[PDB]
Design a protein around this ligand. Structure first.
Ligand SMILES: CCCCCCCCCCCCCCCCCC(=O)OC[C@H](COP(=O)([O-])OCC(O)COP(=O)([O-])OC[C@@H](COC(=O)CCCCCCCCCCCCCCCCC)OC(=O)CCCCCCCCCCCCCCCCC)OC(=O)CCCCCCCCCCCCCCCCC
Ligand SMILES: CCCCCCCCCCCCCCCCCC(=O)OC[C@H](COP(=O)([O-])OCC(O)COP(=O)([O-])OC[C@@H](COC(=O)CCCCCCCCCCCCCCCCC)OC(=O)CCCCCCCCCCCCCCCCC)OC(=O)CCCCCCCCCCCCCCCCC
Ligand SMILES: CCCCCCCCCCCCCCCCCC(=O)OC[C@H](COP(=O)([O-])OCC(O)COP(=O)([O-])OC[C@@H](COC(=O)CCCCCCCCCCCCCCCCC)OC(=O)CCCCCCCCCCCCCCCCC)OC(=O)CCCCCCCCCCCCCCCCC
Ligand SMILES: CCCCCCCCCCCCCCCCCC(=O)OC[C@H](COP(=O)(O)OCCN)OC(=O)CCCCCCCCCCCCCCCCC
Ligand SMILES: CCCCCCCCCCCCCCCCCC(=O)OC[C@H](COP(=O)(O)OCCN)OC(=O)CCCCCCCCCCCCCCCCC
Ligand SMILES: CCCCCCCCCCCCCCCCCC(=O)OC[C@H](COP(=O)(O)OCCN)OC(=O)CCCCCCCCCCCCCCCCC
Ligand SMILES: CCCCCCCCCCCCCCCCCC(=O)OC[C@H](COP(=O)(O)OCCN)OC(=O)CCCCCCCCCCCCCCCCC
Ligand SMILES: CCCCCCCCCCCCO[C@@H]1O[C@H](CO)[C@@H](O[C@H]2O[C@H](CO)[C@@H](O)[C@H](O)[C@H]2O)[C@H](O)[C@H]1O
Ligand SMILES: CCCCCCCCCCCCO[C@@H]1O[C@H](CO)[C@@H](O[C@H]2O[C@H](CO)[C@@H](O)[C@H](O)[C@H]2O)[C@H](O)[C@H]1O
Ligand SMILES: CCCCCCCCCCCCO[C@@H]1O[C@H](CO)[C@@H](O[C@H]2O[C@H](CO)[C@@H](O)[C@H](O)[C@H]2O)[C@H](O)[C@H]1O
Ligand SMILES: N=C(N)NC(=N)NCCc1ccc(I)c(Cl)c1
Lengths: 347, 97, 140, 112, 174, 95, 99, 171
């Protein structure tokens, strides 16, 4: 890709998301999703191989199907209220379709099958956009229509995502599939608290984006896409193993790291609503995620895996990738718990 | 509701089921995707026309334009898939299992 | 599914045993169908008759588990004369747990299922008695 | 207001002190980012690029200062809303008559 | 009766959808969609949507569906399999028609049917607007308003179409 | 909107098409203009929780204008009673 | 009715002429990828996208009646320029070539 | 819900203006100039009451003024007028520009015999003012009382008491 075209396509991705977040009209929300999808396909295809073509095709079909269901919900809403305003919907059938459409876009279980495959089939930089920026638009709609959302449906989607995301990650050695199942589990926490306190959805979303961006950036810095490739980092960039260790433990929700804060604040909100079984089940199930984060820390940081002779050649050359914002992101990924009350800025 | 809404809603469902029950040709699924859009256009036009909601008259056109541009992207991916395996069968798109 | 659970919970405890088993079997039998549906969809059976055999296999097991749980749980309350006691479903839950071990021909799985199903069933009675919410309505 | 970071009413509140302990922590986080920047690029961690390290601290403090202001404004708004609601609905928040422990009866549970 | 033309068209509309949704060869699936598109225009025409109806012919049928058929000739099929020669397509085709017929038979007899949701059967003419004598097409006034009210709609639509050109060239370069 | 840029900048990007009682070309009214107008004014500024109960009457009327489900049900009732009576020869339509 | 009668007559007559063409006394007693360029696919897609922009331009004769002429003309020219820009992009990117 | 009041069938009887559209088209410009007062009183009533049942009396005065208008053409200008609207009637679009010769003859006849002046371009589209003794409608939409607004909040914004109060935090 021409560097100027790449920038223009990236801005179109951003503009599609922004349109969704500033629109008060359902048609413009739908247009935002269409624009966003149109511009995201070229960055998935940018390395021109059969796996990239398969990923883009599977992505296109899933997102296109969801956008059709979103439009169907919009028209049903128009039939029963005679208006297009982006807010609660005025028909239960429209609410179910819109909720399922957005769950499909987010990749929540049991509409989750595309996320591991699409992420595996596209470059790390494209996966970073897919699993972070692309969550903003569907979540911003869910933030506005949640009063009309069926509580049983949304909590069922949340519980299944935490279970599927946790179990799916245990069997993975590919770093992009691990991140994909991590994403599915984390969307579950975001939507579980949505009916009770949407502010905690935003808090979990922002913190998730920061840690996920950190992990993808560190994977890109070393061009690692597999567990065994990542296990060579100790014999090249020892510092990077420590950063990876801390970030993974944060993503595991261990105190006193930043990734504890969203799980902690979400448990608080549901208990205030006399919801005890659900937070307890979710916290225990999230130990599945902690297990396969810990496995990565074992092979990356806490043990020294075997190396290769040709690695000595790498010792002589500096790390020249941009690694943009990594020092900032990694510090926020790990050391923000003392500043937790700052979550009220999102209110 | 009116009679027509029964059949128009049914047509959307039929094409949705058709889309979710894949066969072999990827083209056949793109047709079901475009059938869903057709019924959406007809359903919205009928609602907007009957209610005399004048400024919404442009909405079905905007839907048609974006959907067709969206269908163009789908056809581009189909030809790239077909250039790789010689057919558009969806059972060839299983490398990422 | 709300309606099926309603008639089960509508009836008292240790009364109309044949009605409880019908309800529990119906609940369990449906779950076997849902499990069967995804199984054949995501794991294509070798032949049409092979898929029917798999569907019957799963559905029979799920129906059997629910049937025994309701039968065993409602008799226990009847014999012990303790309608509102979690231990009744603890017996009902383990009974259904053992059936799974039999259907899977694994004494280890039966013991594991006995405990997990037994504790789960007991917790369901405590929640019913004390109004535990799983999907709590937002209040604050 | 709508889509305003710090509405005009927030100027009635006292500003955060430049010696705020939270602001010092934010400054510390900025310093840590400066060191990790040197480490990933294999520079001398403590000495390298003092100009860069100065901007890391300054950037974090500057952004941290305004986030602290919004944080304090949002909690003040929360308290302001809550007291107004209590004032406007005295029937839901009655001043109950408190009794003394000599009057109230509490069961004794011996530990023996 | 002619008073039920819209209902009659909507019945054919559904059959066309069953035609290509059962997914025969995409050559015939495309034909089923062309017929549905033409019938879809007919429905829209009878609700006063002259301009919107003709856009279906011009854009949906004369544009998008031509490219669909064009691409099918290149990348999908050149010869079609005998229509209904596959058991699955015929089964789906027969399944849809019978479901459609049972829906139509009951609504006509009762002037109302309950397929999941409640539907009337008196006729679509009953919901129509009664008084009209403006000296213009209201449907045309709304679409023309795109250039005076919908500045925002034009910009984002215009941008997206330009991006479509850029993106498709990137996708197909290889 | 999630970010209300339109209100904050005072720019109308899409609010003009959101409702059918807004300004229209050549003052063409929608069929349910008065019903939507009444329901919007009742529900303005009190929030959807309050509006769902206190403006229920306006919304019910507005929904009747939109879909005419009650009106069709009443006509379908008179049509049933006529083409029945006509069979028992007890009614004769006027010229 | 008149238009439907016209359409029925035109295509019914076409059907009759086609069948009598196929029938007459003869007095006798005894799915893959075409080897076809990607360029031709790109012509079809390019036509489609331009055809969509022509759809947006068709209302222009009615839009010229508005009192908001300043806005109408600016958006009308904006749409055509962007259509020209996409043509320029294809041209410079060798998209209108056949070699 | 109540019963929709409707006026009796004999409360709606009136002498209708039983002439074709090309006759009205030919007479429209003089008609608009001559019958403006009852016409605008009726249109004021319709847009104010929003109820056709409430303007039936003024609607009747519209017919009377129109019948009197045409009885006055029939009494002085019958033959020039018949030539004119017969030329209008011939056109499929009933165009004025095809009949300027016959229009002038009719225009001259009414001016000479009735002092009628044809309104100039732009006149009949003017917004005019009408004097009416009909009281201004109070609740034309028949709207209920509006819900009371939520208790508005007014006061001095003080710092949050003891900060966020989140678990253990002191600020
Ligand atoms: C309160 C909650 C908790 C705290 C929240 C805090 C949130 C983060 C606060 C903002 C952090 C910004 C990053 C700190 C600055 C570090 C970069 C630096 O000092 O280098 C000097 C920078 C370039 O130094 P360098 O040697 O090329 O590389 C520095 C890092 O390696 C460059 O590393 P990089 O590759 O990641 O570069 C990213 C940076 C690009 O780096 C820059 O261009 C510096 C921009 C700093 C912006 C200051 C933001 C704070 C002010 C907000 C207003 O991106 C930006 O532009 C940031 C906007 O010089 C300048 O450009 C000065 C700014 C001129 C405008
Ligand atoms: C109102 C609602 C809308 C109603 C629509 C009315 C109908 C209008 C048409 C709608 C579109 C239908 C599109 C059908 C389609 O294109 O997919 C053909 C689809 C794939 O075509 P194929 O590649 O030629 O393979 C044919 C067989 O699947 C054989 O391929 P195989 O390699 O898989 O052979 C082994 C076979 C073995 O089959 C089994 O083992 C079945 C065992 C079931 C146990 C009970 O495996 C399967 O059949 C997999 C599917 C089995 C069903 C999964 C459980 C559900 O084949 C079918 O499954 C035929 C089903 C069509 C039934 C028509 C009625 C539709 C009812 C759908 C539910 C509607 C609810 C709403
Ligand atoms: C500027 C200036 O000149 O004066 C500022 C200030 C003078 O202000 P002041 O009004 O006189 O009152 C200061 C009193 O000491 C404090 O007065 P205070 O009444 O405001 O009390 C402090 C208050 C103020 O609000 C704050 O939250 C500020 C947080 C202070 C930093 C704590 C983070 C380090 C955690 C301990 C390790 O803290 C809280 O209310 C929350 C309690 C925080 C407990 C720490 C753990 C909370 C998160 C749990 C996960 C982390 C576990 C431990 C790791 O002097 C300072 O104390 C500096 C602030 C300390 C932070 C900057 C230094 C960074 C420390 C890095 C620790 C490395 C950890 C190794 C692992
Ligand atoms: C707060 C989170 C901040 C996240 C910052 C992430 C910065 C990007 C990652 C830094 C690592 C180096 C880098 O610049 O990323 C590379 C990538 C560009 O792709 P690349 O392969 O490097 O080259 C393109 C030429 N084909 O860069 C990109 O494509 C940018 C993709 C990331 C943008 C989405 C970030 C998440 C959303 C942030 C919103 C926060 C709310
Ligand atoms: C304050 C409030 C917040 C509280 C939460 C806790 C915040 C702390 C987490 C901050 C984020 C992680 C950043 C940690 C900085 C690590 C830098 C370091 O200590 O040195 C790394 C070391 C140097 O390697 P290098 O520079 O490449 O070459 C050495 C030649 N002299 O690299 C090596 O030599 C590799 C050594 C082998 C790996 C040993 C792994 C065990 C040690 C891990 C310690 C970090 C664990 C972080 C978890 C939190 C701890 C509480
Ligand atoms: C410690 C934990 C707390 C740290 C939080 C730091 C977040 C960054 C500071 C931003 C503060 C802010 O004002 O944003 C809060 C805003 C409020 O959410 P909103 O939907 O607008 O409505 C609120 C009504 N309750 O909502 C948000 O801004 C949060 C949602 C972020 C979504 C990212 C969208 C990025 C779009 C950027 C477009 C420009 C490209 C850069
Ligand atoms: C609270 C602390 C949070 C972590 C602070 C950020 C870590 C910064 C220290 C660092 O990353 O560098 C380690 C550095 C390694 O030594 P050096 O020989 O200079 O090799 C670097 C080659 N460029 O070490 C140095 O020589 C610089 C001296 C500072 C080292 C600090 C060690 C950090 C250990 C953090 C463990 C977790 C603490 C709890
Ligand atoms: C290893 C642990 C595994 C997870 C264990 C999870 C335990 C979860 C407990 C489930 C919730 C408690 O169980 C549920 O409680 C509510 C009461 O609030 C009951 O609610 C019902 O009870 C009454 C009984 O008269 C019925 O009339 C009525 O239908 C309804 O009120 C449900 O019938 C019961 O199923
Ligand atoms: C903008 C705000 C920035 C605030 C920065 C405040 C601290 C800045 C310190 C700058 C000077 C650091 O200078 C650097 O320090 C370390 C230890 O101190 C020295 O290097 C060290 O190596 C080893 C320890 O690793 C020891 O032998 C000994 O401690 C020392 O020799 C370097 O020889 C010196 O170059
Ligand atoms: C990819 C490119 C992205 C570039 C984004 C640039 C943003 C463009 C902003 C367009 C909207 C400008 O702001 C908006 O313009 C239109 C026309 O001028 C105005 O609209 C005007 O035309 C009609 C006439 O009645 C009505 O909509 C309205 O009565 C009138 O104000 C809006 O009052 C104004 O709010
Ligand atoms: N929907 C929810 N339960 N949560 C929620 N956002 N409640 C609103 C209550 C609240 C809480 C903190 C602050 I600071 C402010 Cl100003 C207001």
């Amino acid at each position: 890709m021409n560097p100027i075209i790449f920038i223009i396509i990236l801005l179109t991705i951003m503009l599609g998301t922004i349109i969704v977040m500033i629109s008060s009209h359902w048609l413009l929300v739908w247009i935002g999703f269409e624009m966003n999808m149109l511009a995201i396909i070229p960055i998935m295809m940018k390395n021109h191989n059969p796996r990239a073509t398969e990923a883009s095709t599977k992505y296109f079909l899933t997102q296109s199907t969801a956008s059709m269901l979103l439009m169907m919900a919009v028209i049903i809403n128009l039939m029963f209220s005679g208006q297009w305003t982006v807010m609660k919907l005025f028909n239960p059938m429209a609410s179910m379709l819109m909720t399922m459409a957005l769950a499909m876009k987010l990749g929540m279980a049991p509409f989750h099958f595309w996320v591991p495959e699409v992420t595996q089939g596209i470059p790390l930089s494209s996966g970073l956009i897919l699993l972070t920026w692309q969550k903003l638009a569907p979540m911003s709609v869910l933030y506005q229509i949640f009063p009309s959302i069926n509580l049983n449906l949304i909590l069922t989607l949340s519980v299944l995502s935490i279970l599927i995301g946790g179990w799916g990650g245990l069997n993975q050695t590919q770093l992009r599939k691990i991140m994909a199942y991590s994403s599915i589990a984390h969307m579950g926490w975001m939507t579980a608290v949505l009916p009770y306190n949407p502010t905690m959805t935003l808090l979990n979303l922002i913190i998730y984006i920061i840690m996920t961006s950190t992990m993808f950036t560190m994977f890109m810095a070393n061009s690692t896409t597999t567990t065994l490739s990542l296990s060579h980092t100790w014999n090249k960039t020892p510092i990077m193993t420590v950063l990876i260790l801390a970030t993974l433990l944060s993503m595991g929700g261990l105190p006193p790291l930043s990734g504890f804060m969203p799980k902690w604040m979400i448990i608080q909100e549901m208990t205030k609503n006399n919801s005890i079984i659900l937070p307890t089940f979710m916290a225990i199930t999230a130990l599945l995620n902690l297990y396969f984060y810990m496995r990565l820390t074992y092979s990356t940081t806490l043990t020294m895996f075997p190396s290769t002779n040709n690695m000595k050649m790498k010792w002589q050359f500096p790390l020249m990738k941009k690694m943009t914002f990594l020092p900032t992101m990694v510090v926020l990924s790990t050391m923000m718990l003392p500043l937790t009350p700052m979550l009220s800025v999102l209110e | 509701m009116s009679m027509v809404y029964m059949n128009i809603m049914m047509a959307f469902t039929v094409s949705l089921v058709g889309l979710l029950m894949y066969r072999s040709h990827l083209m056949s699924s793109l047709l079901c995707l475009e059938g869903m859009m057709l019924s959406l256009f007809v359903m919205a036009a009928l609602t907007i026309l009957n209610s005399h909601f004048t400024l919404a008259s442009m909405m079905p056109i905007i839907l048609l334009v974006f959907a067709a541009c969206e269908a163009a992207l789908g056809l581009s991916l189909l030809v790239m898939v077909s250039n790789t395996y010689g057919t558009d069968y969806v059972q060839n798109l299983n490398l990422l299992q | 599914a709300k309606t099926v659970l309603r008639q089960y919970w509508d009836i008292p405890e240790g009364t109309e045993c044949h009605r409880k088993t019908y309800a529990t079997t119906s609940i369990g039998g449906a779950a076997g169908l849902v499990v069967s549906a995804y199984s054949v969809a995501l794991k294509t059976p070798t032949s049409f008759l092979e898929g029917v055999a798999r569907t019957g296999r799963y559905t029979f097991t799920a129906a059997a588990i629910g049937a025994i749980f309701g039968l065993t749980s409602c008799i226990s309350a009847q014999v012990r004369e303790k309608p509102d006691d979690p231990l009744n479903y603890l017996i009902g839950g383990c009974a259904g747990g053992l059936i799974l071990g039999a259907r899977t021909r694994s004494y280890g799985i039966g013991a594991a299922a006995c405990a997990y199903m037994g504790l789960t069933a007991a917790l369901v009675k405590m929640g019913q008695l004390e109004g535990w919410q799983v999907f709590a309505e937002p209040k604050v | 207001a709508t889509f305003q970071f710090l509405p005009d009413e927030a100027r009635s509140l006292p500003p955060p002190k430049l010696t705020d302990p939270r602001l010092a922590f934010v400054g510390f986080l900025g310093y840590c980012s400066g060191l990790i920047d040197n480490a990933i690029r294999r520079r001398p961690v403590l000495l390298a690029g003092l100009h860069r390290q100065l901007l890391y601290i300054t950037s974090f403090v500057f952004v941290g200062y305004y986030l602290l202001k919004r944080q304090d404004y949002m909690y003040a708004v929360r308290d302001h809303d809550m007291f107004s609601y209590i004032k406007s609905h005295p029937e839901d928040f009655p001043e109950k008559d408190k009794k003394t422990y000599g009057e109230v009866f509490e069961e004794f549970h011996p530990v023996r | 009766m002619m008073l039920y033309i819209v209902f009659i068209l909507s019945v054919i509309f559904v059959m066309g959808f069953v035609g290509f949704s059962s997914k025969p060869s995409p050559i015939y699936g495309g034909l089923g969609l062309i017929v549905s598109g033409g019938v879809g225009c007919g429905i829209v025409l009878n609700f006063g949507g002259s301009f919107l109806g003709l856009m279906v012919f011009l854009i949906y049928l004369g544009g998008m569906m031509v490219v669909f058929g064009y691409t099918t000739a290149m990348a999908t099929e050149q010869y079609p399999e005998i229509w209904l020669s596959n058991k699955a397509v015929l089964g789906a085709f027969v399944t849809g028609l019978l479901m459609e017929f049972f829906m139509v038979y009951y609504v006509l007899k009762d002037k109302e049917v309950e397929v999941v949701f409640e539907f009337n059967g008196l006729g679509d003419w009953v919901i129509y607007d009664t008084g009209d004598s403006g000296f213009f097409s209201e449907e045309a006034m709304g679409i023309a308003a795109l250039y005076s009210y919908g500045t925002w709609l034009v910009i984002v639509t215009g941008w997206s179409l330009l991006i479509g050109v850029v993106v498709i060239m990137e996708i197909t370069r290889g | 909107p999630f970010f209300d840029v339109q209100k904050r900048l005072g720019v109308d990007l899409d609010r003009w098409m959101t409702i059918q009682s807004a300004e229209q070309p050549h003052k063409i009214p929608s069929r349910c203009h008065a019903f939507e107008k009444e329901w919007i004014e009742c529900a303005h500024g009190i929030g959807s929780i309050r509006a769902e109960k206190e403006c229920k009457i306006e919304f019910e009327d507005f929904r009747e204008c939109l879909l005419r489900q009650k009106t069709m049900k009443r006509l379908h009732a008179i049509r049933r009673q006529r083409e029945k009576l006509i069979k028992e020869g007890k009614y004769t339509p006027p010229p | 009715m008149n238009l439907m009668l016209a359409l029925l007559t035109n295509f019914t007559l076409a059907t009759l002429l086609v069948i009598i063409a196929f029938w007459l006394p003869q007095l006798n007693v005894y799915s893959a990828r075409l080897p076809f360029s990607m360029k031709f696919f790109l012509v079809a897609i390019t036509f489609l996208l331009f055809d969509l922009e022509i759809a947006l331009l068709l209302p222009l004769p009615w839009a010229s009646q508005t009192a908001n002429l300043n806005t109408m003309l600016t958006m009308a020219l904006f749409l055509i320029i962007l259509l020209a820009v996409s043509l320029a992009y294809e041209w410079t990117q060798k998209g209108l070539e056949w070699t | 819900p109540g019963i929709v009041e409707l006026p009796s069938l004999e409360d709606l009887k009136v002498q209708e203006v039983k002439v074709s559209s090309s006759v009205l088209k030919a007479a429209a410009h003089h008609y608009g100039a001559q019958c403006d007062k009852p016409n605008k009183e009726f249109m004021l009533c319709r847009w104010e009451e929003k109820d056709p049942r409430r303007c039936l009396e003024e609607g009747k005065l519209v017919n009377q003024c129109a019948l009197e208008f045409f009885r006055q053409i029939k009494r002085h200008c019958a033959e020039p007028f018949t030539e004119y609207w017969t030329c209008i009637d011939y056109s499929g679009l009933q165009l004025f520009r095809r009949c300027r010769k016959q229009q002038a003859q009719f225009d001259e006849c009414v001016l000479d015999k009735l002092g009628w002046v044809r309104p100039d371009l732009g006149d009949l589209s003017k917004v005019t003012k009408v004097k009416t003794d009909r009281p201004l409608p109070e609740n034309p939409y028949h709207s209920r009382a509006r819900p009371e607004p939520n208790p508005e909040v007014e006061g001095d914004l003080k710092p949050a008491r003891h900060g966020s109060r989140l678990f253990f935090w002191t600020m």
